[PDB]
Amino acid sequence: MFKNLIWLKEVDSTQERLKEWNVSYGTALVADRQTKGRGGLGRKWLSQEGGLYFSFLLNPKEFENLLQLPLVLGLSVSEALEEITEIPFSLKWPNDVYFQEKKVSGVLRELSKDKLIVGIGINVNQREIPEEIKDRATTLYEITGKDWDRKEVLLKVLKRISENLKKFKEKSFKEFKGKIESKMLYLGEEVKLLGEGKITGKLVGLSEKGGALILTEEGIKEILSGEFSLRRS
Numbered sequence: 001m002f003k004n005l006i007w008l009k010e011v012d013s014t015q016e017r018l019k020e021w022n023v024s025y026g027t028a029l030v031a032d033r034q035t036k037g038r039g040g041l042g043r044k045w046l047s048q049e050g051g052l053y054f055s056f057l058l059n060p061k062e063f064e065n066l067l068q069l070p071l072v073l074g075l076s077v078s079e080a081l082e083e084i085t086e087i088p089f090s091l092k093w094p095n096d097v098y099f100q101e102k103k104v105s106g107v108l109r110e111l112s113k114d115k116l117i118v119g120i121g122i123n124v125n126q127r128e129i130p131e132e133i134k135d136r137a138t139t140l141y142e143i144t145g146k147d148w149d150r151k152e153v154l155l156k157v158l159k160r161i162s163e164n165l166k167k168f169k170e171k172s173f174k175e176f177k178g179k180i181e182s183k184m185l186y187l188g189e190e191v192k193l194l195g196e197g198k199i200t201g202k203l204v205g206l207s208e209k210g211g212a213l214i215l216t217e218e219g220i221k222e223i224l225s226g227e228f229s230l231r232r233s
């Protein structure tokens with residue numbers, strides 16, 4: 001039941017606040033502005049007006065795999081945006097939501113004590129996109145040519161997250177493998193993964209474990225580490 005909100009006008013980071021405050025699971029902390037945002041395309045643009053920045057607590061004892069989780073959340077984020085805008089979106093392993101070549105959303109997940117802090121940033125109404133990420137990022141406004149009710153968006157997103165997380169629990173990742181893999185970005189293309197190494201080859205798909213399958217010279221390798229980031233090559 002992700003439907004009750006805590007909407008602030010400015011914080012250092014919704015991630016940090018939930019790391020500090022003791023909130024109940026299933027409640028989303030939203031912030032119009034973030035002075036010390038962290039993750040994805042940087043801190044500078046996470047302080048822009050028009051973006052949708054929020055975080056929420058999940059039970060660590062209940063969502064053990066922090067590789068499939070980001071994918072399911074990303075799948076939930078894209079599904080909500082597609083339902084709203086009726087625009088096709090792609091998923092970039094292992095977390096980002098993309099429209100074509102540029103990112104629209106990113107899923108962050110941290111752990112602290114007995115907390116699983118999930119932070120999600122969505123590009124909705126930012127009008128003045130930074131020149132340094134004009135190439136890698138886009139907004140709902142830029143794509144569709146109109147603004148969107150950030151509250152309406154957040155609600156349908158929280159709903160999909162809720163609905164999908166219930167299935168991911170009751171059932172398994174098998175329920176989303178096909179949905180996710182079929183929306184994967186750079187699929188069939190030459191790509192390069194970096195993090196705890198650097199593997200380069202053709203992204204051939206997604207394993208039932210949520211791992212990225214790369215076709216190298218000596219076989220297809222399955223990448224499970226969340227450390228890795230997937231970029232073109």
Ligand SMILES: O=C(O)CCCC[C@@H]1SC[C@@H]2NC(=O)N[C@@H]21
Binds near residue numbers: 038106107119
């Ligand atoms: O870009 C990413 O992939 C990571 C998530 C983007 C940042 C979100 S926005 C709200 C929350 N608070 C943060 O400091 N980070 C996350």
